[PDB]
Design a protein around this motif. Structure first.
Motif, mmCIF file in Angstrom:
data_model
loop_
_atom_site.group_PDB
_atom_site.id
_atom_site.type_symbol
_atom_site.label_atom_id
_atom_site.label_comp_id
_atom_site.label_asym_id
_atom_site.label_seq_id
_atom_site.Cartn_x
_atom_site.Cartn_y
_atom_site.Cartn_z
ATOM 1 N N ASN A 65 0.820 -1.201 0.000
ATOM 2 C CA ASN A 65 0.000 0.000 0.000
ATOM 3 C C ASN A 65 0.860 1.261 0.000
ATOM 4 O O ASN A 65 2.049 1.243 0.327
ATOM 5 C CB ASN A 65 -0.931 0.005 1.211
ATOM 6 N N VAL A 66 0.230 2.370 -0.385
ATOM 7 C CA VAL A 66 0.836 3.692 -0.375
ATOM 8 C C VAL A 66 -0.100 4.617 0.398
ATOM 9 O O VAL A 66 -1.305 4.373 0.494
ATOM 10 C CB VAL A 66 1.096 4.218 -1.805
ATOM 11 N N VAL A 67 0.472 5.684 0.965
ATOM 12 C CA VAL A 67 -0.294 6.597 1.810
ATOM 13 C C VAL A 67 -1.479 7.210 1.078
ATOM 14 O O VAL A 67 -2.443 7.643 1.719
ATOM 15 C CB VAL A 67 0.621 7.703 2.371
ATOM 16 N N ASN A 68 -1.436 7.268 -0.251
ATOM 17 C CA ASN A 68 -2.548 7.787 -1.041
ATOM 18 C C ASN A 68 -2.792 6.903 -2.254
ATOM 19 O O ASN A 68 -2.986 7.389 -3.372
ATOM 20 C CB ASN A 68 -2.299 9.233 -1.463
ATOM 21 N N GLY A 69 -2.783 5.587 -2.049
ATOM 22 C CA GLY A 69 -3.013 4.664 -3.137
ATOM 23 C C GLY A 69 -4.475 4.565 -3.523
ATOM 24 O O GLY A 69 -5.378 4.948 -2.781
ATOM 25 N N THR A 70 -4.702 4.033 -4.725
ATOM 26 C CA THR A 70 -6.060 3.884 -5.231
ATOM 27 C C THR A 70 -6.782 2.701 -4.598
ATOM 28 O O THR A 70 -8.009 2.742 -4.440
ATOM 29 C CB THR A 70 -6.041 3.725 -6.750
ATOM 30 N N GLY A 92 -6.559 1.722 -1.516
ATOM 31 C CA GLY A 92 -7.102 2.198 -0.256
ATOM 32 C C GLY A 92 -8.405 2.949 -0.438
ATOM 33 O O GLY A 92 -9.355 2.753 0.325
ATOM 34 N N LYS A 93 -8.472 3.808 -1.459
ATOM 35 C CA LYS A 93 -9.699 4.550 -1.730
ATOM 36 C C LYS A 93 -10.835 3.612 -2.115
ATOM 37 O O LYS A 93 -11.962 3.758 -1.627
ATOM 38 C CB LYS A 93 -9.458 5.581 -2.832
ATOM 39 N N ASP A 140 -14.246 3.047 0.058
ATOM 40 C CA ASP A 140 -15.512 3.264 -0.634
ATOM 41 C C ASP A 140 -16.444 2.074 -0.462
ATOM 42 O O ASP A 140 -17.618 2.240 -0.101
ATOM 43 C CB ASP A 140 -15.264 3.539 -2.118
#
Length: 192
Positions: free
Chosen positions: A130-135, A137-138, A142
């Motif tokens: 994961n990344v701090v603003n990965g897709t 995670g979004k 959601d």
């Protein structure tokens, strides 16, 4: 991606599609068994078979994305896996409550909990890179807010059944009836 050929076909998307089909099937078979608190032998066997099939599909997806392979990560991110998993959450939040009210369904409840564990480890394997603003995670948050009710219900279930291992055998219930194997009049248990 069958790099080297000319008409490459995606197996990940096909597995996701079959999982979505079997998820819709599971949800429909449960909606059939609504209101009636009776699960016959066929209602147990035909349900456990599809439980095993869905468990195998989840294990296959987990093995697809087990290694930090961003290709399959993005493939599952941009697909219809979220609909299948929110349907599974919806069916779990109600089946866990329905199967616990009566006996003769502990095998079904255990298989359902195993399937839920496999599903949650599958969707957890999506965040190992994961990344701090990965897709991913979004997409995951959601699908969480889309089914906030069912996940909150299963969270209440887990909280209620986790606040029992310590609430009983720590202060008073362990000394209430010290005869031997666990016997309780079920009336002292209520006040306890």
């Amino acid at each position: 991606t069958q790099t080297g050929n000319n008409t490459t076909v995606n197996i990940i998307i096909s597995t996701v599609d079959y999982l979505l089909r079997v998820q819709e099937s599971i949800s429909d078979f449960y909606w059939y068994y609504s209101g009636k608190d009776i699960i016959d032998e066929q209602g147990q066997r035909n349900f456990s078979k599809a439980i095993q099939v869905a468990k195998q599909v989840f294990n296959t997806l987990t093995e697809y994305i087990q290694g930090p392979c961003t290709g399959n990560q993005q493939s599952l991110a941009h697909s219809r896996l979220w609909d299948a998993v929110v349907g599974f959450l919806h069916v779990f939040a109600h089946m866990q409550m329905k199967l616990s009210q009566d006996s003769s369904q502990i095998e079904l409840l255990k298989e359902l909990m195993d399937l839920q564990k496999d599903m949650v480890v599958m969707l957890l394997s999506m965040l190992e890179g994961n990344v701090v603003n990965g897709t991913i995670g979004k997409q995951m948050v959601d699908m969480l807010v889309e089914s906030s009710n069912n996940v909150e219900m299963i969270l209440k279930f887990f909280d209620m059944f986790l606040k029992l291992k310590d609430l009983t055998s720590s202060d008073t219930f362990k000394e209430y009836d010290p005869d031997g194997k666990g016997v309780i009049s079920k009336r002292d248990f209520h006040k306890a």
